[PDB]
Protein backbone atom coordinates (compact mmCIF):
# COMPACT_ATOMS: atom_id res chain seq x y z
CA UNK A 1 0.00 0.00 0.00
CA UNK A 2 1.24 3.53 -0.75
CA UNK A 3 2.01 5.91 2.10
CA UNK A 4 3.17 9.53 2.35
CA UNK A 5 6.53 10.76 3.72
CA UNK A 6 6.70 12.28 7.22
CA UNK A 7 6.13 15.95 7.98
CA UNK A 8 8.58 18.00 10.05
CA UNK A 9 7.43 21.27 11.64
CA UNK A 10 8.21 24.00 12.45
CA UNK A 11 9.84 24.95 9.15
CA UNK A 12 12.01 27.49 10.99
CA UNK A 13 12.81 27.72 14.69
CA UNK A 14 14.81 30.46 16.44
CA UNK A 15 15.89 30.04 20.07
CA UNK A 16 18.30 31.92 22.31
CA UNK A 17 21.26 29.96 23.65
CA UNK A 18 20.48 27.68 26.58
CA UNK A 19 16.81 26.98 25.90
CA UNK A 20 15.37 23.72 24.61
CA UNK A 21 14.22 23.53 20.98
CA UNK A 22 11.57 21.03 19.88
CA UNK A 23 10.39 19.85 16.46
CA UNK A 24 7.42 17.61 15.71
CA UNK A 25 7.84 14.78 13.19
CA UNK A 26 4.48 13.32 12.14
CA UNK A 27 4.29 10.00 10.30
CA UNK A 28 1.18 8.10 9.18
CA UNK A 29 2.43 4.52 9.30
CA UNK A 30 0.74 1.69 7.42
CA UNK A 31 2.37 -1.05 9.53
CA UNK A 32 4.06 -1.34 12.93
CA UNK A 33 7.53 -2.26 11.61
CA UNK A 34 9.19 1.12 11.09
CA UNK A 35 11.78 3.45 12.59
CA UNK A 36 12.13 7.24 12.61
CA UNK A 37 15.61 8.73 12.28
CA UNK A 38 16.44 12.35 13.16
CA UNK A 39 19.11 13.77 10.86
CA UNK A 40 21.36 16.83 11.01
CA UNK A 41 22.80 18.06 7.72
CA UNK A 42 26.40 18.54 6.50
CA UNK A 43 27.19 20.94 3.62
CA UNK A 44 27.50 18.00 1.17
CA UNK A 45 23.77 17.10 1.32
CA UNK A 46 24.96 14.17 3.45
CA UNK A 47 22.83 12.65 6.19
CA UNK A 48 24.03 12.43 9.80
CA UNK A 49 21.96 10.51 12.36
CA UNK A 50 21.43 12.26 15.72
CA UNK A 51 18.89 9.89 17.31
CA UNK A 52 16.08 7.56 16.33
CA UNK A 53 12.87 6.02 17.61
CA UNK A 54 12.87 3.29 18.61
CA UNK A 55 16.37 3.78 20.04
CA UNK A 56 19.30 2.34 18.12
CA UNK A 57 20.39 -0.66 20.18
CA UNK A 58 23.74 -1.10 18.40
CA UNK A 59 25.63 2.08 19.36
CA UNK A 60 24.57 3.11 22.89
CA UNK A 61 25.91 5.94 25.04
CA UNK A 62 24.87 8.60 22.53
CA UNK A 63 24.37 12.31 23.08
CA UNK A 64 21.55 12.66 25.61
CA UNK A 65 21.00 16.23 24.40
CA UNK A 66 19.20 14.97 21.26
CA UNK A 67 16.07 13.11 22.35
CA UNK A 68 13.16 11.55 20.45
CA UNK A 69 9.89 10.97 22.30
CA UNK A 70 6.89 9.09 20.91
CA UNK A 71 3.66 10.91 21.70
CA UNK A 72 0.80 8.52 22.53
CA UNK A 73 -1.48 9.56 19.66
CA UNK A 74 0.10 7.00 17.33
CA UNK A 75 1.78 9.23 14.73
CA UNK A 76 3.50 12.22 16.37
CA UNK A 77 7.05 12.41 17.71
CA UNK A 78 9.05 15.10 19.55
CA UNK A 79 12.64 15.72 18.42
CA UNK A 80 14.13 18.08 21.00
CA UNK A 81 17.61 19.51 21.55
CA UNK A 82 18.07 20.29 25.24
CA UNK A 83 20.28 23.25 26.21
CA UNK A 84 21.07 24.17 22.63
CA UNK A 85 24.56 25.51 21.93
CA UNK A 86 25.49 28.04 19.27
CA UNK A 87 26.90 25.38 16.93
CA UNK A 88 23.66 23.39 17.27
CA UNK A 89 22.15 25.70 14.63
CA UNK A 90 21.76 24.23 11.17
CA UNK A 91 19.47 22.16 8.97
CA UNK A 92 17.47 19.30 10.51
CA UNK A 93 14.98 16.72 9.26
CA UNK A 94 13.40 13.39 10.15
CA UNK A 95 13.13 10.25 8.07
CA UNK A 96 10.87 7.19 8.19
CA UNK A 97 12.21 3.73 7.33
CA UNK A 98 9.36 1.24 6.99
CA UNK A 99 10.21 -2.44 7.31
CA UNK A 100 6.89 -3.98 6.18
CA UNK A 101 5.34 -4.69 3.76
CA UNK A 102 8.21 -3.16 1.76
CA UNK A 103 11.45 -1.75 3.16
CA UNK A 104 11.56 1.87 2.03
CA UNK A 105 12.96 5.15 3.37
CA UNK A 106 11.25 8.50 2.81
CA UNK A 107 12.69 11.76 4.13
CA UNK A 108 10.78 14.74 5.47
CA UNK A 109 11.20 18.27 4.21
CA UNK A 110 14.07 20.10 5.84
CA UNK A 111 13.87 22.70 8.59
CA UNK A 112 16.28 25.18 10.15
CA UNK A 113 17.43 26.02 13.66
CA UNK A 114 19.13 29.25 14.75
CA UNK A 115 20.60 29.39 18.24
CA UNK A 116 21.48 33.00 19.02
CA UNK A 117 23.44 34.96 21.61
Amino acid at each position, epitope marked *: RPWNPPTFSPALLVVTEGDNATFTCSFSNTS*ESFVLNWYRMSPSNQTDKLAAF*P*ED*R*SQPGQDCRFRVTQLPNGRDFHMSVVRARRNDSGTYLCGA*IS*LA*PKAQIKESLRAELRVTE
Partner: antibody
Amino acid sequence: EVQLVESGGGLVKPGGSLRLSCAASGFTFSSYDMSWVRQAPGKGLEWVATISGGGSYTYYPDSVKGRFTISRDNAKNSLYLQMNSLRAEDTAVYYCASPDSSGVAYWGQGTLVTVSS
Amino acid sequence: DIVMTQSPLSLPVTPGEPASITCKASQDVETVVAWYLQKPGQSPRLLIYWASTRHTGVPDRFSGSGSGTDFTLKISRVEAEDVGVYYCQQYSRYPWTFGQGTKLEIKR
Protein backbone atom coordinates in the same frame (compact mmCIF):
# COMPACT_ATOMS: atom_id res chain seq x y z
CA GLU B 1 23.67 -5.51 26.23
CA VAL B 2 20.85 -7.01 24.16
CA GLN B 3 20.36 -10.60 25.32
CA LEU B 4 18.05 -13.27 23.86
CA VAL B 5 17.74 -16.75 25.40
CA GLU B 6 15.62 -19.53 23.88
CA SER B 7 13.88 -22.34 25.74
CA GLY B 8 11.55 -25.25 25.09
CA GLY B 9 13.41 -27.20 22.41
CA GLY B 10 13.85 -30.94 22.40
CA LEU B 11 12.64 -34.10 20.69
CA VAL B 12 9.06 -34.63 19.51
CA LYS B 13 7.35 -37.26 17.37
CA PRO B 14 5.98 -36.32 13.92
CA GLY B 15 2.62 -34.60 14.16
CA GLY B 16 3.30 -33.48 17.72
CA SER B 17 3.39 -29.94 19.05
CA LEU B 18 6.10 -27.89 20.75
CA ARG B 19 6.25 -24.34 22.13
CA LEU B 20 9.46 -22.28 22.08
CA SER B 21 10.16 -19.38 24.42
CA CYS B 22 12.54 -16.44 24.04
CA ALA B 23 13.32 -14.22 27.03
CA ALA B 24 14.69 -10.79 26.13
CA SER B 25 16.58 -8.06 27.96
CA GLY B 26 18.65 -4.98 27.20
CA PHE B 27 16.05 -2.93 25.30
CA THR B 28 12.47 -1.70 25.38
CA PHE B 29 10.98 -5.00 24.22
CA SER B 30 7.58 -3.65 23.13
CA SER B 31 9.01 -1.21 20.55
CA TYR B 32 10.93 -3.67 18.35
CA ASP B 33 10.08 -6.53 16.02
CA MET B 34 10.72 -10.09 17.14
CA SER B 35 11.42 -13.02 14.84
CA TRP B 36 12.26 -16.70 14.58
CA VAL B 37 14.93 -17.96 12.17
CA ARG B 38 15.74 -21.66 11.89
CA GLN B 39 18.65 -23.58 10.40
CA ALA B 40 18.62 -27.27 9.57
CA PRO B 41 21.83 -29.04 10.67
CA GLY B 42 24.49 -28.36 8.05
CA LYS B 43 22.19 -26.20 5.91
CA GLY B 44 21.34 -22.52 5.53
CA LEU B 45 19.15 -19.98 7.29
CA GLU B 46 15.38 -19.83 6.78
CA TRP B 47 13.08 -17.11 8.12
CA VAL B 48 10.23 -18.62 10.13
CA ALA B 49 8.13 -15.75 11.52
CA THR B 50 8.10 -12.09 12.53
CA ILE B 51 5.86 -10.17 14.92
CA SER B 52 5.56 -6.42 15.31
CA GLY B 53 6.27 -4.63 18.57
CA GLY B 54 2.62 -3.88 19.27
CA GLY B 55 1.87 -7.47 18.29
CA SER B 56 -0.87 -6.73 15.74
CA TYR B 57 1.18 -7.72 12.66
CA THR B 58 2.54 -11.23 12.17
CA TYR B 59 4.33 -12.57 9.10
CA TYR B 60 4.96 -16.18 8.03
CA PRO B 61 6.35 -17.92 4.95
CA ASP B 62 4.33 -20.50 3.06
CA SER B 63 6.40 -23.41 4.42
CA VAL B 64 5.14 -22.95 8.01
CA LYS B 65 2.01 -20.86 7.45
CA GLY B 66 -0.98 -22.54 9.07
CA ARG B 67 1.20 -24.64 11.41
CA PHE B 68 3.34 -22.13 13.34
CA THR B 69 2.01 -19.19 15.35
CA ILE B 70 4.28 -16.38 16.55
CA SER B 71 3.08 -14.47 19.60
CA ARG B 72 4.49 -12.19 22.26
CA ASP B 73 3.88 -10.95 25.80
CA ASN B 74 5.05 -7.34 26.08
CA ALA B 75 4.39 -7.23 29.83
CA LYS B 76 6.73 -10.21 30.33
CA ASN B 77 9.48 -9.28 27.81
CA SER B 78 9.12 -12.66 26.10
CA LEU B 79 8.42 -14.13 22.67
CA TYR B 80 6.76 -17.44 21.79
CA LEU B 81 6.49 -19.77 18.81
CA GLN B 82 3.76 -22.41 18.87
CA MET B 83 4.73 -25.23 16.49
CA ASN B 84 1.91 -27.64 15.64
CA SER B 85 1.81 -30.52 13.18
CA LEU B 86 5.57 -30.93 13.06
CA ARG B 87 7.19 -32.74 10.14
CA ALA B 88 10.68 -34.15 9.69
CA GLU B 89 11.79 -31.16 7.60
CA ASP B 90 11.06 -28.96 10.63
CA THR B 91 14.06 -30.49 12.47
CA ALA B 92 16.42 -27.54 12.95
CA VAL B 93 18.03 -25.14 15.41
CA TYR B 94 15.56 -22.32 16.12
CA TYR B 95 17.09 -18.89 16.77
CA CYS B 96 14.91 -16.15 18.14
CA ALA B 97 15.93 -12.77 16.78
CA SER B 98 15.04 -9.08 16.71
CA PRO B 99 15.28 -7.32 13.34
CA ASP B 100 15.45 -3.59 12.74
CA SER B 101 16.53 -1.27 9.93
CA SER B 102 19.99 -2.90 10.14
CA GLY B 103 18.55 -6.33 9.34
CA VAL B 104 18.59 -9.27 11.77
CA ALA B 105 21.01 -7.55 14.14
CA TYR B 106 20.41 -9.65 17.29
CA TRP B 107 20.36 -13.45 17.51
CA GLY B 108 19.77 -15.79 20.41
CA GLN B 109 21.84 -18.89 20.99
CA GLY B 110 19.30 -21.15 19.27
CA THR B 111 17.58 -24.26 20.60
CA LEU B 112 17.47 -27.58 18.76
CA VAL B 113 14.11 -29.07 17.75
CA THR B 114 14.24 -32.68 16.54
CA VAL B 115 11.29 -34.39 14.83
CA SER B 116 11.67 -38.15 14.53
CA SER B 117 10.03 -41.45 15.39
CA ASP C 1 9.61 -15.08 -3.31
CA ILE C 2 12.96 -13.39 -3.95
CA VAL C 3 15.98 -15.61 -4.58
CA MET C 4 19.39 -14.58 -3.25
CA THR C 5 22.02 -16.34 -5.37
CA GLN C 6 25.51 -16.37 -3.86
CA SER C 7 28.79 -17.07 -5.62
CA PRO C 8 30.93 -18.91 -4.92
CA LEU C 9 29.83 -21.50 -2.36
CA SER C 10 33.40 -22.33 -1.27
CA LEU C 11 36.11 -19.67 -1.09
CA PRO C 12 39.70 -20.79 -0.41
CA VAL C 13 41.74 -17.69 0.45
CA THR C 14 45.37 -17.23 1.55
CA PRO C 15 45.85 -15.06 4.66
CA GLY C 16 46.33 -11.42 3.74
CA GLU C 17 44.80 -11.92 0.29
CA PRO C 18 41.54 -10.07 -0.43
CA ALA C 19 38.32 -12.05 -0.70
CA SER C 20 35.01 -11.05 -2.28
CA ILE C 21 31.61 -12.76 -2.32
CA THR C 22 28.86 -11.98 -4.84
CA CYS C 23 25.12 -12.06 -4.15
CA LYS C 24 22.48 -11.51 -6.84
CA ALA C 25 18.79 -10.93 -6.11
CA SER C 26 16.13 -12.42 -8.37
CA GLN C 27 14.41 -9.01 -8.46
CA ASP C 28 15.06 -5.41 -7.48
CA VAL C 29 15.52 -5.05 -3.71
CA GLU C 30 17.11 -1.58 -3.80
CA THR C 31 19.83 -1.61 -1.11
CA VAL C 32 17.99 -3.60 1.60
CA VAL C 33 20.67 -6.28 1.93
CA ALA C 34 22.54 -7.58 4.99
CA TRP C 35 25.65 -9.76 5.28
CA TYR C 36 26.27 -12.20 8.13
CA LEU C 37 29.16 -14.39 9.22
CA GLN C 38 28.45 -17.62 11.13
CA LYS C 39 31.43 -19.33 12.72
CA PRO C 40 31.03 -23.10 13.18
CA GLY C 41 28.99 -23.91 16.26
CA GLN C 42 27.89 -20.29 16.76
CA SER C 43 24.91 -18.13 15.92
CA PRO C 44 24.98 -15.83 12.88
CA ARG C 45 26.55 -12.41 13.36
CA LEU C 46 25.74 -9.27 11.39
CA LEU C 47 28.61 -7.71 9.42
CA ILE C 48 27.13 -5.27 6.88
CA TYR C 49 23.66 -3.73 6.71
CA TRP C 50 21.91 -1.56 4.13
CA ALA C 51 24.24 -3.01 1.48
CA SER C 52 27.22 -0.90 2.62
CA THR C 53 27.04 0.29 6.25
CA ARG C 54 29.27 -1.52 8.73
CA HIS C 55 27.56 -2.82 11.85
CA THR C 56 28.84 -1.73 15.26
CA GLY C 57 32.12 -3.45 16.10
CA VAL C 58 32.83 -4.91 12.65
CA PRO C 59 36.50 -4.40 11.69
CA ASP C 60 37.18 -1.93 8.90
CA ARG C 61 38.59 -4.65 6.62
CA PHE C 62 34.98 -5.72 5.96
CA SER C 63 33.05 -3.70 3.40
CA GLY C 64 29.86 -4.04 1.42
CA SER C 65 28.71 -2.59 -1.87
CA GLY C 66 26.03 -2.94 -4.50
CA SER C 67 22.49 -1.85 -5.31
CA GLY C 68 19.50 -2.97 -7.31
CA THR C 69 20.11 -6.69 -7.83
CA ASP C 70 23.94 -6.94 -7.64
CA PHE C 71 25.76 -6.93 -4.29
CA THR C 72 29.31 -7.69 -3.15
CA LEU C 73 30.95 -8.36 0.21
CA LYS C 74 34.68 -7.62 0.38
CA ILE C 75 37.32 -8.57 2.96
CA SER C 76 40.45 -6.56 2.18
CA ARG C 77 42.90 -8.75 4.13
CA VAL C 78 41.57 -12.13 5.24
CA GLU C 79 42.58 -13.03 8.79
CA ALA C 80 42.39 -16.54 10.21
CA GLU C 81 39.44 -15.41 12.38
CA ASP C 82 37.18 -14.87 9.34
CA VAL C 83 36.59 -18.59 8.67
CA GLY C 84 32.92 -19.50 8.58
CA VAL C 85 29.83 -19.30 6.40
CA TYR C 86 28.85 -15.95 4.90
CA TYR C 87 25.18 -15.28 4.16
CA CYS C 88 23.54 -12.50 2.20
CA GLN C 89 19.92 -11.64 2.93
CA GLN C 90 17.25 -9.33 1.55
CA TYR C 91 14.75 -7.78 3.95
CA SER C 92 12.86 -5.66 1.42
CA ARG C 93 9.79 -7.89 1.03
CA TYR C 94 8.35 -10.82 2.91
CA PRO C 95 9.33 -13.58 2.92
CA TRP C 96 12.86 -12.68 3.96
CA THR C 97 15.24 -14.90 2.03
CA PHE C 98 18.90 -15.75 2.64
CA GLY C 99 21.65 -16.97 0.38
CA GLN C 100 22.75 -20.59 0.38
CA GLY C 101 25.96 -19.75 2.23
CA THR C 102 29.59 -19.16 1.30
CA LYS C 103 32.14 -21.21 3.23
CA LEU C 104 35.38 -19.29 3.68
CA GLU C 105 38.32 -21.66 4.13
CA ILE C 106 41.98 -20.76 4.55
CA LYS C 107 44.20 -21.74 1.63
CA ARG C 108 47.43 -23.39 2.77
